[PDB]
């Protein structure tokens, strides 16, 4: 029953069966590398990948720095037997952890079932293996045997934390996206992981740790395994499909390459950035590709290169693609079976869903970028278990994701140098000197991934404006934990394809990795001259670096940006002079006690309101914290919110384009009562679909263009609060170390207590801030986006009402007996709006509970 049914040690002797030196497809001539077959169809090679790609042979940092927020290099990693033993055991342990969830059991079983198609022949009656979907397995005597293979885990290339799914291409076939599939090579390391900031789960866990949390490498591996799943079933989305961004404005990223394949694979909100028109186009495309597989199987008459029979190989692919087969042996694609398989491969197998099964903390969107690299070691059971990961049951690490908190669980995480420098990729934002008073420009560098995601309009498409033909026939059209259990129940575990004998290939298998779209470097260091302080200036103003003297808080953004010993606070002037005052030893602890009170009072303030649609609270200090709406005061912010609504938060106003909706053309059947009536009912049903489509489109637009903005403001509000805590800490601490080491011995001061209290107050603040910003997001949706939709939908309703009433009149002869009933039906149905229910379009119990 375990996925890995054998203990593997790197120094174990070879047997040519599941422990062996192997050769994989290679462009030149690769040396055999020791590998381990940890499960049918799945191998692990504990080596750095200097093999799959001829250019990437050097393990040193590149000439030009890679355009990613976090990268890590060490040419010595994974060069020793002990490291390779630890790698192997870590990967093996992560497979069992994935397998130990229902979802992973399914995914891993789909992967094993998803053998690359036998489309190696050019004759359309012959099945034949494709060479590059195989390996050569060296025997203990020095001979070799060739074997088919679905998946290989290998060590990373130069950039140790660049994890990706690679695959050998074909001169004619695009195997990863034509339904065929190909053997997948995942660059991965269990020995490092990413660190990220999270502040959302603070309402459920008010005791959430300060600082960075570590990504569970099981989530990371599951992510790459999802990719490998898509690619094995040959339904990956071409990487030339990218969600392109606007990069011109001062507040926008300089560049961002995120593929549709990645959005799909993440799941959650990210997957919904892709509109319905593109979504359905994909599904239809892959459906036809599966149909081609069924058809080539139907005309297959022979098989070469194996003793395995034709009926056996056909069945292997009937099973992989869940084809139907009639009693004469003719294979076909069933629309319903395809839809379920495609839905499972792309919507059930997602990172988001894996995070639910693991019950770990994780970035909620790709836009919450990784911020650090950590060294880890998950092999020792005292560090990490198959069932609990880092969050070990019956310990203090069990709750609040404490095991993933790199500060609380610091022995498990060593923070490493990010080889992407802080301002390697940046924009230079300058408040024009005259604005500040002439006096110099106030220029700061802003890291690329601290800027805003502004999706290009071209990412969003629709055929709302197209008309359609209503017919008597016309066809009338969520992922829950229960649904996943229902899909789970269709799985037969135990039943896998055999490892069959194939004829030996060449000693060297010639292979080239799938041709990838070349990507341009972003422009870097672009300079902007601005007529205001930005959020970014207000945030930078709250920072400090290493220094010898006492930091002082100031309420002037300007002063703080000009003086390394001065830090901007949005707290009250009273707070400013209290923290800044010289404080004698005998009053130290009461002074600390008061500052914590004050810090808490200021950060937990909430104003209630009855004057803004769908916004019942306001956090007033958000105004001066980030200069929201370019109004430097709390009073300015509160009033500006009530006046203009949620828009003042936005860095940019989204385009929301709903065109005149296409008109329904009704077909007349002038000799048939039933058909005429069905046509009228169909028109009504299609109308109901139209509201749904319009709403769904607007939700997609809102999530990608508006909600992402509020998300970043939320992240930055947390950074601001942390900045305030750190500054207050540094000052309190400076004041302490001014005392005699006799005063200090009496005042047994523990800065850890201070940090813990301030973190708690930051969590409580973030609870309010998150509720507030949630309300703002939904309120903007409800009051500034959806109404454009409903107006267009009401125009359409009115137009449709006229058409249907005319249709009934023109067919009153045919509709003898029913004219008046059909009028009521049409009039009643098209008189009142279809209410928008957010829960129909998103399953975030967070944004849902706001609605």
């Amino acid at each position: 029953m375990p996925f890995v049914n054998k203990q593997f040690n790197y120094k174990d002797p070879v047997n040519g069966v599941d422990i062996a030196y192997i050769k994989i497809p290679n462009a030149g001539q690769m040396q055999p590398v020791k590998a381990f077959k940890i499960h049918n169809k799945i191998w692990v090679i504990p080596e750095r990948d200097t093999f799959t790609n001829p250019e990437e042979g050097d393990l040193n940092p590149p000439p030009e720095a890679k355009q990613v927020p976090v990268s890590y290099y060490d040419s010595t990693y994974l060069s020793t037997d002990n490291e390779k033993d630890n790698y192997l055991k870590g990967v093996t342990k992560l497979f069992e952890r994935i397998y130990s969830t229902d979802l992973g059991r399914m995914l891993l079983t789909s992967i094993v079932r998803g053998i690359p198609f036998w489309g190696g022949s050019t004759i359309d009656t012959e099945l034949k293996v494709i060479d590059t979907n195989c390996i050569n397995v060296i025997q203990p005597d020095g001979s070799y045997r060739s074997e088919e293979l679905n998946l290989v885990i290998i060590g990373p290339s130069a950039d140790i934390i660049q994890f990706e799914c690679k695959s050998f291409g074909h001169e004619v076939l695009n195997l990863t996206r034509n339904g065929y599939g190909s053997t997948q090579y995942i660059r991965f390391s269990p020995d490092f992981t990413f660190g990220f900031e999270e502040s959302l789960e603070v309402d459920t866990n008010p005791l959430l740790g300060a600082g960075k949390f570590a990504t569970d490498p099981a989530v990371t591996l599951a992510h790459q395994l999802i990719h490998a799943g898509h690619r094995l079933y040959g339904i990956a989305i071409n990487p030339n499909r990218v969600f392109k961004v606007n990069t011109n404005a001062y507040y926008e990223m300089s560049g961002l390459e995120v593929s549709f394949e990645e959005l799909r694979t993440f799941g959650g909100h990210d997957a919904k950035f892709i509109d319905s028109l593109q979504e359905n186009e994909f599904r239809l495309y892959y459906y036809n590709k599966f149909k081609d597989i069924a058809s080539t199987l139907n005309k297959a008459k022979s098989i070469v290169g194996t003793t395995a029979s034709l009926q056996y190989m056909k069945n292997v692919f009937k099973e992989k693609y869940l084809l139907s087969e009639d009693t004469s042996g003719k294979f076909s694609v069933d629309k319903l079976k395809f839809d379920k398989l495609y839905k499972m491969l792309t919507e059930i197998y997602t990172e988001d869903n894996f995070v639910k099964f693991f019950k770990v903390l994780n970035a909620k969107t790709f836009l919450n970028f990784d911020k650090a690299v950590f060294k880890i070691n998950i092999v020792p059971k005292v560090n990490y278990t198959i069932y609990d990961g880092f969050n070990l049951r019956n310990t203090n690490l069990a709750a609040n994701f404490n095991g993933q908190n790199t500060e609380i669980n610091n022995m498990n995480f060593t923070k490493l140098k990010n080889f992407t420098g802080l301002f390697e990729f940046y924009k230079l934002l300058c408040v024009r000197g005259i604005i500040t008073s002439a006096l110099n420009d106030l220029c700061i560098k802003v890291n690329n991934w601290d800027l805003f995601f502004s999706p290009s309009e071209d990412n969003f498409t629709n055929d709302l404006n197209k008309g359609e033909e209503i017919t008597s026939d016309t066809n009338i059209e969520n992922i829950s934990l229960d649904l996943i259990q229902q899909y789970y129940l269709t799985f037969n575990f135990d039943n896998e394809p055999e490892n069959i004998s194939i004829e030996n290939l060449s000693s060297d298998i010639i292979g080239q990795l799938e041709l990838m779209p070349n990507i341009e470097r972003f422009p870097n260091g672009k300079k902007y001259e601005l007529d205001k302080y930005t959020m970014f200036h207000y945030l930078r103003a709250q920072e400090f670096e290493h220094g010898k003297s006492r930091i002082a808080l100031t309420n002037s953004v300007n002063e703080a940006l000009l003086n390394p010993s001065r830090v901007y606070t949005f707290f009250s002037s009273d707070y400013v002079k209290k923290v800044n005052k010289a404080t004698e030893a005998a009053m130290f602890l009461g002074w600390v006690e008061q500052l914590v009170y004050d810090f808490t009072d200021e950060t937990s303030e909430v104003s209630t309101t009855d004057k803004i649609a769908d916004i019942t609270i306001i956090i007033p200090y958000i105004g001066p914290a980030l200069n929201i709406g370019n109004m430097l005061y709390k009073d300015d912010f509160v009033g500006a919110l009530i006046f203009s609504g949620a828009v003042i938060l936005l860095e940019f106003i989204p385009e929301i384009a709903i065109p005149v909706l296409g008109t329904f053309a009704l077909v007349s059947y002038i000799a048939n009562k039933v058909l005429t009536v069905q046509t009228i009912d169909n028109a009504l049903s299609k109308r109901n679909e139209k509201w749904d489509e319009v709403y769904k489109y607007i939700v997609t637009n809102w999530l990608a263009k508006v909600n992402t903005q509020i998300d970043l403001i939320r992240k930055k509000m947390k950074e601001a609060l942390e900045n305030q805590a750190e500054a207050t800490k540094a000052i309190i601490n400076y004041q302490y170390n001014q005392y005699t080491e006799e005063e200090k011995n009496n005042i047994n001061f523990n800065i850890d207590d201070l940090s813990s209290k301030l973190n708690e107050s930051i969590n409580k603040a973030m609870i309010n801030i998150n509720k507030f910003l949630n309300q703002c997001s939904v309120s903007y949706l409800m009051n500034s986006m959806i109404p454009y939709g409903v107006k267009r939908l009401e125009d359409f309703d009115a137009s449709l009402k006229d058409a249907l009433l005319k249709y009934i009149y023109d067919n009153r002869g045919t509709l003898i007996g029913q004219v008046d009933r059909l009028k009521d039906k049409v009039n009643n149905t098209l008189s009142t709006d279809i209410p928008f229910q957010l829960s129909k379009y998103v399953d975030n119990q967070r944004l849902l509970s706001t609605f």
Partner: nanobody
Amino acid sequence: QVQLVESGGGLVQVGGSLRLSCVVSGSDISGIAMGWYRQAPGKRREMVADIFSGGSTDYAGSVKGRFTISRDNAKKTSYLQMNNVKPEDTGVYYCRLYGSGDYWGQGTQVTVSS
């Protein structure tokens, strides 16, 4: 009902250029991928180029750089531009609409001659 009608097609001299066209009737093309396939005698039909509704394309490796696929949603048309044709390009070409049906053109011979 849905019909794909191709036009154009060889004879064509080695190294030469040629365009195949196809017009779709009975459906709207918008939101639906299209592609061109070819089939030489005795050999399996193979995708040559794909083009999705928003203009993004895909090619068989051995025609990339020589062939260009295009489409016009308002006109419900696709075309395949073929440059620097080789003897390996000889065969019967089909346009396809990737909808919910089997939507193919009749097939048009392209013959590359030295």
